[PDB]
């Protein structure tokens, strides 16, 4: 029960007692996930207090990416969907221009699937090739052109793969983690060191050639035709001073 220094992109109120919620074991890490208490209590405000959040979790109203997951401290981290059956809602939680967990209202035909970066492709047991992804869905029998640091498109009815975005020089990219969060565009340079500290450089509307760690990046799709929608003008971070200079 160690707390009061949470990941400060959760933005919980500081005069809200003393502690802060401990995300349990789950598909994502500690300081890059967001549990449903912080979601439904001080991020969109559907329930006032945490035991009422436990009531709406226990009453089967919420399902993260297909099944219910009746748990308060469930670390449903990045890129998954939350299909609130009542309110007709499909919260995909994605990132923003500033570092927070922006929300969407996804259509049902896009909320029927999710995607994610792989972490390794291995041979598991009895000579069966299986891949993993970033949220622990170790799924069997891929197409064996799946490479490391690539994205598959999980079907979310079954755990099958419908398509994959074989990343190379020049297919549209997202970022996650680091001080260059929430940016798009993949076409300047493709650096490859020996031991990390490398990026596929970024090109945007203002063509900002940017880099970060290769662990801090993953793909979406084709340039101009993305697989996921993106919030508030497909986040760019031009400048707030230029925004207040123009409009």
């Amino acid at each position: 029960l160690k707390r009061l220094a949470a990941p400060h992109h959760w933005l919980l109120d500081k005069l809200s007692g003393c502690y802060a919620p401990r995300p349990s074991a789950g598909p994502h890490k500690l300081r890059e996930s967001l549990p449903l208490i912080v979601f439904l209590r001080n991020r969109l405000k559907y329930a006032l207090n945490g035991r009422e959040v436990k009531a709406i979790l226990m009453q089967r109203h919420v399902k993260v990416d297909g099944k219910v997951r009746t748990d308060t401290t469930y670390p449903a981290g990045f890129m998954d969907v939350i299909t609130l059956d009542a309110t007709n809602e499909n919260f995909r939680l994605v990132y923003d221009v500033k570092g927070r967990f922006a929300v969407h209202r996804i259509t049902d035909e896009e909320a029927s699937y999710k995607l994610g970066k792989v972490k390794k492709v291995q041979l598991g047991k009895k000579g069966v090739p299986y891949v993993v992804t970033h949220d622990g869905r170790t799924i069997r029998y891929p197409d064996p052109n799946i490479k490391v640091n690539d994205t598959v498109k999980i079907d979310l009815a079954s755990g099958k793969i419908t398509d994959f975005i074989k990343f190379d020089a020049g297919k549209l990219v997202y970022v996650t983690g680091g001080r260059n969060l929430g940016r798009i565009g993949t076409i300047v340079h493709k650096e490859r060191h020996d031991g990390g500290f490398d990026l596929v450089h970024i090109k945007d509307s203002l063509d900002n050639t940017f880099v970060t760690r290769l662990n801090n990046v993953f793909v979406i799709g084709e340039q101009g035709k993305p697989y996921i929608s993106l919030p508030k003008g497909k986040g760019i971070k031009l400048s707030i001073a230029e925004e207040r200079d123009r409009r």
């Binding site: 226990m58 059956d85 009542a86 309110t87 007709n88 049902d108």
Partner: protein, 687 residues
Amino acid sequence: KRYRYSSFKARIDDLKIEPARNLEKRVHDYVESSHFLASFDQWKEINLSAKFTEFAAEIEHDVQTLPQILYHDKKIFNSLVSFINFHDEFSLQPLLDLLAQFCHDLGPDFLKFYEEAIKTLINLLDAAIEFESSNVFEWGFNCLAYIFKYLSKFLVKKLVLTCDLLIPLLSHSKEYLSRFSAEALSFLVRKCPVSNLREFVRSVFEKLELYEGLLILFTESMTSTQETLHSKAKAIMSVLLHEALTKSSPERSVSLLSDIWMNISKYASIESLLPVYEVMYQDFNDSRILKVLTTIVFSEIPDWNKITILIERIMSQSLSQDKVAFLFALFIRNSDVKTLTLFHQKLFNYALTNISDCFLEFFQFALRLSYERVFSFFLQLFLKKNWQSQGKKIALFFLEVDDKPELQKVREVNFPEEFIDFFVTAEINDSNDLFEIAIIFKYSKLQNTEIIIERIFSTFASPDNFTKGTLLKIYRKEDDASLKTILDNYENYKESLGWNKLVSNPSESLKGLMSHYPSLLLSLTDNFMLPDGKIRYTLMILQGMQVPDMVIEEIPLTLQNARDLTIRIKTKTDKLVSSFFLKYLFGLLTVRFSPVWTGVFDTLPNVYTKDEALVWKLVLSFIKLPDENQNLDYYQPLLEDGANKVLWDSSVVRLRDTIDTFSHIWSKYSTQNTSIISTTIERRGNT
């Protein structure tokens, strides 16, 4: 402690519609002069389903201003029908509530859509059967009953049409759909007047041949009021039901009306029956009314019941009648009517079966009419009374010998004129009835034993022996001739009723070695016969008789240990009897404490006192054994049925029908008199 997590069946069984008893619901009577706009704009703010919001986006220009409701009547109903038959589970409360307030707001112009609405929601209720969520048909049956509550003024003639539309909800072979449709139809029965009601029930009685239980639920919820009373429509609903009955109806109509009378009499049972039974008796005075009389008298007014039964008996004289007389004798509290009913049932037939059913129900009194029934004119009733209980046999001892004594002497003459398997069965059918009729019968029984010299005929000779110093010489003759438990009971009766010892004594140790069979009752009777024979011609024998005649398990373990200790501390008859009763205790196979105590105390005394032979006999008794006593002819059954499917009236009808099937016919009575069986040839696979 809350959040019980009821099951689906728990929700449904605890669910009941009653929309008047749906107490407050002030969501639509606060009308903003349009009432559909009121319910609609409430539901648009409380519920957000996706297709309900798209339904509102298709409809929203065409909801306000009730004249613009009445002009655009077709498009809003076609949109509501399209989205109801779309039927997402989450968008079913607003659509059904809007349909209910829609019919409320139209009224007489709804009738063009009334025959589409019900079948669309019927498809919805079948989809809800598939969906398995009790909220769905809670909303569905509530909206259906609101449609009934708002169109009851105009559903006067078309009750037959709405039942033709609501057949697949009354009869669906699911249980709860029947009750949920039936109580809404019951509210519609608490309505439109008596002539339309009686022609409606006369037109719906044709559908009897789960419709019976569905109509039972409908009529029961119609007549039943809120709590501990009957409704105001009961004093005319019973009249309409009874006047649509009485031979202008189908076959099971009397059974359905009897089940309705039983359910209403079980429900109300305090004071509102005083307004129903008056009209019921006044309508039942016009004349099967015995089914209604049995239903009226089974559930625990007596003077009017006596007058109606007198009129029924006179109209009958100028079975079910036996069952009605049995129920009246079991339930009434009138001495004059009971003493007249004894002679009335004596004028009626099957008095022996009626006395058997009455003794099975309540052995009250008045065993002096069966004597006149026997003098008018048998086997199986006197046989069951003889093998019956203590007070039953003590009351049957009066009219045992007090039968037709001319017929008893005729049976004695026909038994003295001996013929002698089937002839022995005829002798047993004479013998069990003539056993209650001395030296002449004893010599005739000795002649029959010599002529027959199967085991049922041996038990029949034993029955004649129980019917019996000339008797002591006859018992010596039967000893010279010497089921088996009945034979040992006959030997006990003979020893209860010198030179015989000089003749016989052999037999003592033979009966001792025979008292090790597969029946503790046969062992007790054989030890009784051996004790009586050793008396008339000992301490360990009487102690073993006492100890063989969970606390009982521990006491019997200690007692068998004590008797084995006494026999270990200490004639050849006593030794053989102790070894055979110890083998009987080790092969009783019905109490593990005694079956452990015998096998734990037997290996202390001497061996080879027929011990290895008895152990080989136990290890070889599982070789080959069966039984085939006798047979008879065959006859018919399955009559006298006033009810089929209800509460415990069905169980009472099954018991009286099984008794009438036992004492039913000649071949059935012969087979049932053969069915009196002796002790068991059993206890395999553990010895």
